[PDB]
C-alpha cells in the first residue's frame, strides 16, 4: 500500500516558523515529482509547491514564492516544506500530494475529490 | 476521533500485513529452481487488420476464436474475421469517444462505451442483417473504461466515476452497483465461473468483488501508480495487473498478497493492456514503448517482444483456443500474432 | 451521523477482508505450477503450432 | 464445399461493401478537424463555443459541436460530464489538431491552477504534439479588476513587480498601459511554460478574448492553419 | 575492347544498382502497412516503377555490348531504347514535380488539402504523366529528330541519326522547362513559408531568455541538368563531343538508382520501415 504521512504543524502565531515533513512509503520516492497542496477552511484545494525528481526543478505558487521552501531527500523518502514568515492566509490542511506517474513532468493533484496519492492531512493554523 | 479510526485501520491492516507475511514463507521464484524456462518465443504478424481511421483503443476476441470486435476512436466498431481478414461488420457509433468494447460469449451481441458515459449494446444476430443498437445503459456518471458480458443479459461495466456496475440489459437498470473503489477503475476481468470478478483502479488497488452479493470480497494494493489493465489467470485463482508504475503484478486471491512483480530497469512506460495465455504460462503486456512484451508468468522473465506498431499498444487479447494473440494499437492497425 | 456510518462501513469492509482463509504462497506457487504443467502440452503459444493446424498460415 | 464457396463469396461481398463505406467515411473524417476544448468553471468556454455556435437538447455527457469557417469543418469537444480528475480521459485526445484552452484572466487566484493545468497538458507524453490555442477570456473584466484597484495582482503574482510590457496592439488593448501590462503578464505566464519544452512539435497561440468576441472562430481557423503548416514543415526538419 | 569494357562496366554499375534499389523500394511501398496509400506514395511508387523500367531497358545495351543480339531491322533498337528510357525519365521528372505540387498545396491549402488531393486525382495524375511523356517523344518515329542521346552507346545510332533544333526546342519548352519551373516555384514558396515560421519560432524563443524530399529533388536536378545543357548545346549548332555526350547521358540515367539510395539512406522513418521489412524478410 502507499502511505503519505505528514508530521509537523500545530498552532503558530503569525510571523513564526515551521517545517512539515512527509514520510512517504510504498513506492520509489525518487522517481516521482512531489507536491505540497493546502486546503484553507471554507475553500477547495489549491496547489502550493512542487519539486521534481532530482530536486533541481522547483516551483511555488504566487503567494509563498519567497517565504516557503520545498525540499526532498530520496534516501530518506521524505518531503519537507520549510515554512517561514507565516501568515493568517496560511491556515490550511497540508497534504504531500504525489504526481500520479513516475518519470513525467505532468501532474494532476489539486482534485476536489479524493485523489489517491494525496497525503492524509495536517492541520496548520495561524 | 478520526485519528483513532485511522490507527484502528492501521492496526487491522497490520494484521493483514502479518497474515500476508505468514503466507510469505518462501517467494515463488525461490521454489522454481526445477522448472524449465520457456527460453525463446517469437511471434509474427499473421494478419495486419487495417481498416481503422483513428487510434484503436479496444478489442475483444470471440469465443469462436475467429470473430473479433475492435473499437477505434473515429466512431467505428468493426467486427473482423481473423482468419480471412474480412470485415464482417462495421458499426458507426453515436459518439466516437469509446474506450472499451465487449464481445458477448454467445457471440450474439457487442457492447461499447466511453466518454459518452453510456454502455451501448448492439445486436449482431439481427433478423434484417443490419446491426442496430439494442439498449443504452446510462447510469454511470464518469466515463466507461471496461465492460464484459457475463451472458446475453447480464453485463458488468467499469467506469471513471469510481464505481463498477452490473446491469440487466433487457431491463436497462443496474442489477447492482459496486461502490468500493476510490478512483477511476480502468479494467475489469471476469473469472471463468462468472461468479466473481476483479478490477484495478487508479487508486493503485486491484479489488475482487462477488457478482451475486454485490460486495468487495478482497482488496490488493501492491502497485505504486494507476492500474490500466487486469486479467484473471485462466484457472481463476490468480490475476495479473498492469499499472502505470511500468510493472506488472501477479496477485493470488487465496493468499490476498502479490506473488510476482514483472518489471525491468529499462522499461519506463505504463502497461496499457495485459492478457494471459490459455495455459497461463505466458503473460502478455501492452506498453507505451510502442511494442508488446510477453513474459513467463512463473519466473518473471521476458520471454519475448512483439514489436510491430508505430504507436502505443492500446489493446491486447488472446483467443480462447489460445492460437492467436491480437494486438491493436494507436497506429490504427491490429496485428495478429502466433 | 455520516461519520459513524462511514466508520461502520469501512470497518466492516476491512473486517470482511480480515477473516479470510489465507493459504501460504508456497502452496499458491505450487497450484500455479500444477495448472501450468497441466496445460504445458496443450498451449498453442508455449509451443508453436505446426502450420497445418494453424488457421492463419 | 459449394455452399462453403458461396459463404466465402458472401463474406468477400460484405468486406467490399464495408470497405467502400469506410472510404466514404474516411473522406469526411479527414475533412473534419477535431478540437478538444478545455477550461474551468470560471473560464467562459461555454460563451466562446456559443459565439462559434450561434453566429436537440441532450445530456449525453460531453458537449460536441460543429462549426464551419471557409468551408472547413470544425468539430469541438467540451468534455463536461466526467469527474474532476482528468489524467485518463485526456489520453483520448492525442490526435486532436488543437487543444483549446480557455482561461478566466480576471480571477488571479484561479490562474495558478490554470497554469498548472496548462503545464500538465503541455508536458503530457500524449499531448506533447498538440498545439494549444490559449483563449485568455474576460479581458473586459480584467480591465475592471486592474483599473478598480483593491485586488492586488502583485500579491497574487509577485513577478509582476519586475515585469515590463514587450509589445502591444494600438487600438483595442492600447487605451491604458496598466491593464495591457497586466494582460501580457498573464499571457507570458503561459508562454513561459510553452517555450520551456517542446522541440517545435507544438505551440501556444494566445489570444486576448473579451466576454463577447465573434472572431474566435477565425482565430481557431488561422491557428489550426498554422498548426497544419508547421507540422508539414516539421516533416522536413528545416531547423 | 578497352573503351568497350569501360563503357559496359559503367552500364553494369548503373543497372544493377538501379534494378536492386527500385525492386527494394517497390516491395517496401507494396508491403508497408502505414505507408500504403498517401498523396505522395503514388508518385513515389511511380518513380520507383519508372526507374525499374529504366533498368529493364538498360539491360539490353549490356547484352549488345557483350553478347550482341540484334533484331531484323538491327537499328530499331536505339529507336526503341532512346525512346523508351527517355519517356521513363520524363515519367520520373514530372512525377517529382507532381510531388512538388501537392506538398506545396499541403502547405498552401492545409485544411482543405484532402479535398484538393484525392486518390482519384492521383490515378488521373500518373495516367496523364505517362500519356504526356509518351506523346511528346512520338515525333522521333516521324523522322523529325532524335529525342535524346540515350542509345548513343550503339555505335550506329549516334552519327547516323541527327537531332533537330526544332524538335529540341519543341520538347524543352514542353517537357523539360515546365517541370523545372513547377519545382522551382513550389520549393520557392515552401522555403518562403518555412522562413516565415522560423522567424516566428525564433521571435518567441527570443522573448523568453534563460529534408529528404528536398535532397531527392535537388540531387535529381543537379545530376540531370548537365545532360540538358549539353543536349541543347549539341542540338543548337553542330558541335558535339562524344565523350561528354556519353558522360552526361549516363549521369542523367544515374539518378535512377540515386533516388532509392538517397531516400532509404537519408530518411529516418523510411529507414525504420526498411529495417522492419528486412527483418520480416529474414525471419
PDB file of N, CA and C in Angstrom, chain D residues 117-165:
ATOM      1  N   UNK D 117      -2.688  23.428 -14.855  1.00  0.00           N
ATOM      2  CA  UNK D 117      -3.358  22.603 -15.856  1.00  0.00           C
ATOM      3  C   UNK D 117      -2.683  22.722 -17.215  1.00  0.00           C
ATOM      4  N   UNK D 118      -2.348  23.950 -17.621  1.00  0.00           N
ATOM      5  CA  UNK D 118      -1.642  24.183 -18.879  1.00  0.00           C
ATOM      6  C   UNK D 118      -0.288  23.488 -18.902  1.00  0.00           C
ATOM      7  N   UNK D 119       0.449  23.543 -17.794  1.00  0.00           N
ATOM      8  CA  UNK D 119       1.747  22.887 -17.736  1.00  0.00           C
ATOM      9  C   UNK D 119       1.612  21.374 -17.754  1.00  0.00           C
ATOM     10  N   UNK D 120       0.526  20.837 -17.190  1.00  0.00           N
ATOM     11  CA  UNK D 120       0.296  19.399 -17.288  1.00  0.00           C
ATOM     12  C   UNK D 120      -0.022  18.986 -18.719  1.00  0.00           C
ATOM     13  N   UNK D 121      -0.855  19.768 -19.406  1.00  0.00           N
ATOM     14  CA  UNK D 121      -1.233  19.460 -20.783  1.00  0.00           C
ATOM     15  C   UNK D 121      -0.046  19.591 -21.726  1.00  0.00           C
ATOM     16  N   UNK D 122       0.797  20.598 -21.504  1.00  0.00           N
ATOM     17  CA  UNK D 122       1.968  20.794 -22.348  1.00  0.00           C
ATOM     18  C   UNK D 122       2.939  19.627 -22.246  1.00  0.00           C
ATOM     19  N   UNK D 123       3.175  19.130 -21.042  1.00  0.00           N
ATOM     20  CA  UNK D 123       4.212  18.137 -20.816  1.00  0.00           C
ATOM     21  C   UNK D 123       3.676  16.715 -20.770  1.00  0.00           C
ATOM     22  N   UNK D 124       2.400  16.514 -21.076  1.00  0.00           N
ATOM     23  CA  UNK D 124       1.856  15.166 -21.132  1.00  0.00           C
ATOM     24  C   UNK D 124       2.407  14.429 -22.343  1.00  0.00           C
ATOM     25  N   UNK D 125       2.833  13.184 -22.123  1.00  0.00           N
ATOM     26  CA  UNK D 125       3.520  12.398 -23.142  1.00  0.00           C
ATOM     27  C   UNK D 125       2.615  12.050 -24.323  1.00  0.00           C
ATOM     28  N   UNK D 126       1.304  12.234 -24.188  1.00  0.00           N
ATOM     29  CA  UNK D 126       0.387  12.089 -25.303  1.00  0.00           C
ATOM     30  C   UNK D 126      -0.143  13.411 -25.828  1.00  0.00           C
ATOM     31  N   UNK D 127       0.056  14.507 -25.109  1.00  0.00           N
ATOM     32  CA  UNK D 127      -0.326  15.820 -25.599  1.00  0.00           C
ATOM     33  C   UNK D 127       0.877  16.679 -25.950  1.00  0.00           C
ATOM     34  N   UNK D 128       2.069  16.084 -26.006  1.00  0.00           N
ATOM     35  CA  UNK D 128       3.296  16.800 -26.330  1.00  0.00           C
ATOM     36  C   UNK D 128       3.407  17.162 -27.803  1.00  0.00           C
ATOM     37  N   UNK D 129       2.483  16.714 -28.643  1.00  0.00           N
ATOM     38  CA  UNK D 129       2.490  17.056 -30.054  1.00  0.00           C
ATOM     39  C   UNK D 129       1.292  17.891 -30.464  1.00  0.00           C
ATOM     40  N   UNK D 130       0.422  18.253 -29.531  1.00  0.00           N
ATOM     41  CA  UNK D 130      -0.778  19.021 -29.839  1.00  0.00           C
ATOM     42  C   UNK D 130      -0.537  20.469 -29.452  1.00  0.00           C
ATOM     43  N   UNK D 131      -0.710  21.361 -30.412  1.00  0.00           N
ATOM     44  CA  UNK D 131      -0.608  22.778 -30.147  1.00  0.00           C
ATOM     45  C   UNK D 131      -1.858  23.272 -29.436  1.00  0.00           C
ATOM     46  N   UNK D 132      -1.685  24.304 -28.621  1.00  0.00           N
ATOM     47  CA  UNK D 132      -2.741  24.810 -27.758  1.00  0.00           C
ATOM     48  C   UNK D 132      -3.104  26.209 -28.218  1.00  0.00           C
ATOM     49  N   UNK D 133      -4.381  26.438 -28.478  1.00  0.00           N
ATOM     50  CA  UNK D 133      -4.869  27.771 -28.810  1.00  0.00           C
ATOM     51  C   UNK D 133      -5.419  28.351 -27.512  1.00  0.00           C
ATOM     52  N   UNK D 134      -4.549  29.016 -26.760  1.00  0.00           N
ATOM     53  CA  UNK D 134      -4.935  29.616 -25.491  1.00  0.00           C
ATOM     54  C   UNK D 134      -5.884  30.784 -25.704  1.00  0.00           C
ATOM     55  N   UNK D 135      -7.029  30.740 -25.032  1.00  0.00           N
ATOM     56  CA  UNK D 135      -8.036  31.792 -25.105  1.00  0.00           C
ATOM     57  C   UNK D 135      -8.137  32.453 -23.739  1.00  0.00           C
ATOM     58  N   UNK D 136      -7.330  33.483 -23.518  1.00  0.00           N
ATOM     59  CA  UNK D 136      -7.414  34.258 -22.287  1.00  0.00           C
ATOM     60  C   UNK D 136      -8.711  35.047 -22.298  1.00  0.00           C
ATOM     61  N   UNK D 137      -9.692  34.577 -21.542  1.00  0.00           N
ATOM     62  CA  UNK D 137     -11.034  35.128 -21.607  1.00  0.00           C
ATOM     63  C   UNK D 137     -11.214  36.263 -20.604  1.00  0.00           C
ATOM     64  N   UNK D 138     -12.281  37.036 -20.823  1.00  0.00           N
ATOM     65  CA  UNK D 138     -12.730  38.115 -19.939  1.00  0.00           C
ATOM     66  C   UNK D 138     -11.648  39.181 -19.754  1.00  0.00           C
ATOM     67  N   UNK D 139     -11.250  39.782 -20.874  1.00  0.00           N
ATOM     68  CA  UNK D 139     -10.341  40.917 -20.815  1.00  0.00           C
ATOM     69  C   UNK D 139     -11.057  42.188 -20.388  1.00  0.00           C
ATOM     70  N   UNK D 140     -12.333  42.335 -20.753  1.00  0.00           N
ATOM     71  CA  UNK D 140     -13.105  43.492 -20.321  1.00  0.00           C
ATOM     72  C   UNK D 140     -13.371  43.471 -18.823  1.00  0.00           C
ATOM     73  N   UNK D 141     -13.366  42.293 -18.206  1.00  0.00           N
ATOM     74  CA  UNK D 141     -13.475  42.181 -16.758  1.00  0.00           C
ATOM     75  C   UNK D 141     -12.122  42.310 -16.072  1.00  0.00           C
ATOM     76  N   UNK D 142     -11.048  41.853 -16.723  1.00  0.00           N
ATOM     77  CA  UNK D 142      -9.701  42.101 -16.221  1.00  0.00           C
ATOM     78  C   UNK D 142      -9.367  43.585 -16.232  1.00  0.00           C
ATOM     79  N   UNK D 143      -9.865  44.318 -17.231  1.00  0.00           N
ATOM     80  CA  UNK D 143      -9.696  45.768 -17.246  1.00  0.00           C
ATOM     81  C   UNK D 143     -10.348  46.408 -16.030  1.00  0.00           C
ATOM     82  N   UNK D 144     -11.556  45.957 -15.679  1.00  0.00           N
ATOM     83  CA  UNK D 144     -12.213  46.436 -14.468  1.00  0.00           C
ATOM     84  C   UNK D 144     -11.415  46.079 -13.223  1.00  0.00           C
ATOM     85  N   UNK D 145     -10.936  44.836 -13.139  1.00  0.00           N
ATOM     86  CA  UNK D 145     -10.235  44.390 -11.937  1.00  0.00           C
ATOM     87  C   UNK D 145      -8.911  45.117 -11.732  1.00  0.00           C
ATOM     88  N   UNK D 146      -8.231  45.501 -12.808  1.00  0.00           N
ATOM     89  CA  UNK D 146      -6.967  46.215 -12.660  1.00  0.00           C
ATOM     90  C   UNK D 146      -7.182  47.717 -12.490  1.00  0.00           C
ATOM     91  N   UNK D 147      -8.123  48.324 -13.220  1.00  0.00           N
ATOM     92  CA  UNK D 147      -8.344  49.759 -13.087  1.00  0.00           C
ATOM     93  C   UNK D 147      -9.105  50.133 -11.820  1.00  0.00           C
ATOM     94  N   UNK D 148      -9.819  49.191 -11.207  1.00  0.00           N
ATOM     95  CA  UNK D 148     -10.556  49.480  -9.988  1.00  0.00           C
ATOM     96  C   UNK D 148      -9.684  49.452  -8.744  1.00  0.00           C
ATOM     97  N   UNK D 149      -8.471  48.912  -8.832  1.00  0.00           N
ATOM     98  CA  UNK D 149      -7.694  48.714  -7.631  1.00  0.00           C
ATOM     99  C   UNK D 149      -8.314  47.615  -6.783  1.00  0.00           C
ATOM    100  N   UNK D 150      -7.941  47.621  -5.501  1.00  0.00           N
ATOM    101  CA  UNK D 150      -8.476  46.790  -4.418  1.00  0.00           C
ATOM    102  C   UNK D 150      -8.365  45.284  -4.677  1.00  0.00           C
ATOM    103  N   UNK D 151      -7.650  44.872  -5.724  1.00  0.00           N
ATOM    104  CA  UNK D 151      -7.333  43.472  -5.981  1.00  0.00           C
ATOM    105  C   UNK D 151      -5.861  43.417  -6.359  1.00  0.00           C
ATOM    106  N   UNK D 152      -5.047  42.843  -5.479  1.00  0.00           N
ATOM    107  CA  UNK D 152      -3.597  43.010  -5.536  1.00  0.00           C
ATOM    108  C   UNK D 152      -3.007  41.901  -6.396  1.00  0.00           C
ATOM    109  N   UNK D 153      -2.918  42.169  -7.701  1.00  0.00           N
ATOM    110  CA  UNK D 153      -2.313  41.222  -8.633  1.00  0.00           C
ATOM    111  C   UNK D 153      -0.846  40.973  -8.297  1.00  0.00           C
ATOM    112  N   UNK D 154      -0.124  42.002  -7.828  1.00  0.00           N
ATOM    113  CA  UNK D 154       1.243  41.790  -7.355  1.00  0.00           C
ATOM    114  C   UNK D 154       1.281  40.835  -6.167  1.00  0.00           C
ATOM    115  N   UNK D 155       0.256  40.870  -5.314  1.00  0.00           N
ATOM    116  CA  UNK D 155       0.220  39.920  -4.209  1.00  0.00           C
ATOM    117  C   UNK D 155      -0.277  38.556  -4.654  1.00  0.00           C
ATOM    118  N   UNK D 156      -0.880  38.466  -5.839  1.00  0.00           N
ATOM    119  CA  UNK D 156      -1.235  37.157  -6.371  1.00  0.00           C
ATOM    120  C   UNK D 156      -0.120  36.592  -7.233  1.00  0.00           C
ATOM    121  N   UNK D 157       0.643  37.459  -7.879  1.00  0.00           N
ATOM    122  CA  UNK D 157       1.810  37.081  -8.655  1.00  0.00           C
ATOM    123  C   UNK D 157       2.940  38.058  -8.352  1.00  0.00           C
ATOM    124  N   UNK D 158       3.950  37.643  -7.580  1.00  0.00           N
ATOM    125  CA  UNK D 158       4.997  38.589  -7.166  1.00  0.00           C
ATOM    126  C   UNK D 158       5.935  38.990  -8.287  1.00  0.00           C
ATOM    127  N   UNK D 159       5.986  38.225  -9.377  1.00  0.00           N
ATOM    128  CA  UNK D 159       6.832  38.558 -10.515  1.00  0.00           C
ATOM    129  C   UNK D 159       6.325  39.769 -11.282  1.00  0.00           C
ATOM    130  N   UNK D 160       5.094  40.209 -11.018  1.00  0.00           N
ATOM    131  CA  UNK D 160       4.505  41.328 -11.736  1.00  0.00           C
ATOM    132  C   UNK D 160       5.160  42.658 -11.393  1.00  0.00           C
ATOM    133  N   UNK D 161       5.866  42.743 -10.265  1.00  0.00           N
ATOM    134  CA  UNK D 161       6.551  43.980  -9.914  1.00  0.00           C
ATOM    135  C   UNK D 161       7.690  44.278 -10.880  1.00  0.00           C
ATOM    136  N   UNK D 162       8.451  43.256 -11.260  1.00  0.00           N
ATOM    137  CA  UNK D 162       9.619  43.398 -12.126  1.00  0.00           C
ATOM    138  C   UNK D 162       9.314  43.028 -13.571  1.00  0.00           C
ATOM    139  N   UNK D 163       8.123  43.354 -14.067  1.00  0.00           N
ATOM    140  CA  UNK D 163       7.711  42.993 -15.415  1.00  0.00           C
ATOM    141  C   UNK D 163       7.406  44.246 -16.224  1.00  0.00           C
ATOM    142  N   UNK D 164       7.800  44.227 -17.498  1.00  0.00           N
ATOM    143  CA  UNK D 164       7.583  45.329 -18.422  1.00  0.00           C
ATOM    144  C   UNK D 164       6.958  44.812 -19.712  1.00  0.00           C
ATOM    145  N   UNK D 165       6.101  45.635 -20.305  1.00  0.00           N
ATOM    146  CA  UNK D 165       5.338  45.242 -21.491  1.00  0.00           C
ATOM    147  C   UNK D 165       6.238  45.146 -22.715  1.00  0.00           C
TER     148      UNK D 165
END
